[PDB]
Amino acid sequence: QVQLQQSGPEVVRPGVSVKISCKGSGYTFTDHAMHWVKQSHAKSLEWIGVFNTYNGDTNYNQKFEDKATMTIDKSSSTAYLELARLTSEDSAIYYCVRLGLLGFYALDYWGQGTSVTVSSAKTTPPSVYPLAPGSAAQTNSMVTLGCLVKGYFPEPVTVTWNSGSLSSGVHTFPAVLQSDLYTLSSSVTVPSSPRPSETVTCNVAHPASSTKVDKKIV
Amino acid sequence: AIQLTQSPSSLSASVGDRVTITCRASQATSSYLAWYQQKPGKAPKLLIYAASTLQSGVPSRFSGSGSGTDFTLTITSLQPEDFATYYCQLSKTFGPGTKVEIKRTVAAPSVFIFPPSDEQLKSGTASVVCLLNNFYPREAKVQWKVDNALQSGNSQESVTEQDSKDSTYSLSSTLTLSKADYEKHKVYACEVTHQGLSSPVTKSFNRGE
Amino acid sequence: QVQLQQSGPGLVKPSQTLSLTCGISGDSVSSDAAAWDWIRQSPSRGLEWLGRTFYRSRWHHDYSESVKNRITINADTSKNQFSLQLTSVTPEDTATYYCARAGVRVFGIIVNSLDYWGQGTLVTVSSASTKGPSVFPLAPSTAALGCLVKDYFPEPVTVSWNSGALTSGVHTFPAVLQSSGLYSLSSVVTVPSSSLGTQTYICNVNHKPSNTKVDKKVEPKSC
Amino acid sequence: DVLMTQTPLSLPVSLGDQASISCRSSQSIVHSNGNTYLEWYLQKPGQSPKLLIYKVSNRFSGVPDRFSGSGSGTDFTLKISRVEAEDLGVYYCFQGSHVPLTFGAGTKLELKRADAAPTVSIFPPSSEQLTSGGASVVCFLNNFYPKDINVKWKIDGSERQNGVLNSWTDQDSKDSTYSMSSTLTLTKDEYERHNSYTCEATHKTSTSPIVKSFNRNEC
């Protein structure tokens, strides 16, 4: 069975080289070449370059001629990607792809993909802040409660409510970037009748800093 | 850094006989190799590429398959026009190639003799040529008797290529001698023995007749 | 379809640069769907790939380590041709040189399967000089007649019968080296008995390096 | 280089209908040898894009009969006979015929429903943020349709643009709706300087833009 395994995510400083490893299995490596496609948001799916896995002649895209080079270790049946002088906008997801049936197809199977982010800031624990309806917000049977997160790096953060007990109405949001630090928030919808034995507590878990915080809501 | 062998180096099959030709590669790909057919005096013509796909135009009887370190070429039937030297390539280096002939019945050779021309005599030398044509097999013992005496070491023989219609070869032996040697003898005979001849055949001529 | 034509000098004295010109018809040299190889064949050694060129954004090159540092394959899109120049020619480089077009090239990876080989020209390394050949008839006493060519250099020669009118029953022989350093070959054609009295036979021999074109009529001897 | 644009960007389609996606090439992509190498890749959320249809007339193995391609020259279209729950994602048109092999921009496929009015709720910065140093006010628009919406930052009757951040979420599995988050960052001096913190929003459901406003003195 054809399957491509790829490295994990990285976070690196600008101007340093990073390595991406793509190991293939289930097929004879020398038969099929390997591609490399970059996925980001400013650009969408631009093509990096191909590695003719038999001989070794490379066909790089003209835009990534200088900042990317590709190597093959045929002994371990692995394809390598090397990047240099990474810029701030270089944060993207790099896919390794097998080329199948030269003459037909273009790109058969795609690896799970590694996302390399650069930034400049160091790792920083998140700060969890509470949001509650005001003293004049009890005019409706339903109100919106949520907590928000500032000043953390890098992604991701998993947020739960009462240790995941309240999984209905929970809404998180994709992280946003500002002042070199990421940002995200969460919200839930609850009735505006808080019982004395009923409480809402949102917990933020961050494995990059190994810090978990619970915030007092209502 | 890659060595390719062709098995067998040469072979010969009869008309309409299936023949398999195998060439082996240390670094197998089954995707970058191709087989070329070459006739003598002509550029090699592609036959199949990627070790399984047949090129258009060439008859479908040329089929190739196989994977791993081994690769074979299969011809369903042989024709007199299919004589060639088949080459297998591995994207960098061409194999030594296999000489393939065509077998048929034993052919009786025809013998002709030409005394040197008068213009050659004016030049001062003489070149006698014996034509030995349309036979099978190629091997043929050629002898020359001048005044019932054998001559050797002063004649050259050239073998043509096998005809693609009737599958026969042809030979010619040339002797370069001065006019004095030509005028020193009267009778000259061309004697040749072939397995297609029940008895030896000689053609004798006299100079000036 | 795509037809290849070649031109160049068949005689090259040792130890300078030789050059071949391979002209392209029916395709553009700068096409992005093909590549151009240069393959030479030697009877002693066999066949081997020399170099390759193609076009993606600028002219590319690729050469085999056998003849590295003395080969340069320069393309020319103006007249739609590409040419090989070989420097520091040794007497071990005598062979027949073929210009050929690579096949499948899609997806930006080239697969070596050459399918449009040119006619091929032969190049020999020698400090000698070309000179014209000589032709002698061999009219027999019923038998087969023909004309022979002697003491010619260098290869090749083309023999035609009545300017190509007759093509069946005519045999051309490979060149044979003689002791003095020359080459020779012959042609033979079979005839009916009554043909010699009415049919006219004039064989033709051409030698391009010496720019010689000799036409000779062969007939039975008068006396 | 060949530049392609997938028209249109987003496809709001319902279950079991026909949706057409078009990919156009700036220059002819007919490879000189022959054929017209075009590919369509779909990418389900949180996965790796697969191969949907190659050699636009042909069809790859393992994909159902609904997907089919057509067109030649510079215009190609991919049509889905019936849309299922799995068809959601982004569709990329791709070509290999002229190095470099460029790519499309992406076309999102998602469900449709009746337009829903967004519920807007404004919260002041937390009391802990008062002693922190920064300020972050934010209002959400929850459970609405479609992504086309705007958020306004009108403070004390004045208009500003800076300090805004935007974040949309993919369609919910059940309600198939969206969510909004516009957080505004300021410092302490401007926070105490102003009185009324209001955020507005314009949407199809409400002909008049919805204004949710609160004052500082009441909190």
Author numbering:
A (entry chain A): 1 to 52, 52A, 53 to 82, 82A, 82B, 82C, 83 to 100, 100A, ...
B (entry chain L): 1 to 91, 96 to 213
C (entry chain H): 1 to 35, 35A, 35B, 36 to 52, 52A, 52B, 53 to 82, 82A, ...
D (entry chain B): 1 to 27, 27A, 27B, 27C, 27D, 27E, 28 to 214
The study reports:
The VH6-1 class of antibodies includes some of the broadest and most potent antibodies that neutralize influenza A virus. While its heavy chain derived from the canonical IGHV6-1 heavy chain gene used by the class, L5A7 utilized a light chain gene, IGKV1-9, which had not been previously observed in other VH6-1-class antibodies. Antibodies of this class show characteristic immunoglobulin sequence features, such as the use of the IGHV6-1 gene and the presence of an “FG” motif in the third heavy chain-complementary determining region (CDR H3).
The footprint of 28H6E11 on L5A7.5 overlapped almost completely with the paratope of L5A7.5 binding to HA, namely the CDR H1, CDR H3, and CDR L1. For the most distinctive feature of the VH6-1 class antibodies, the FG motif in CDR H3, the anti-idiotype antibody interacted with this motif by ring stacking with residue Tyr32antiID on 28H6E11 light chain, whereas in the binding to HA, the Phe100HC side chain of L5A7.5 was held in a hydrophobic pocket on HA, and the backbone carbonyl of Gly100AHC interacted with His32HA on HA. This difference in binding interactions resulted in a shift in the CDR H3 conformation, reflecting the flexibility of CDR H3 in binding its targets. However, in the interactions of L5A7.5 CDR L1 with 28H6E11, the ring OH from Tyr32LC was involved in an electrostatic interaction with Asn52antiID. While the general regions which L5A7 used to bind influenza A HA overlapped the region recognized by the anti-idiotype 28H6E11 antibody, the different chemistries involved in the two interactions highlight the multifaceted nature of the selection.
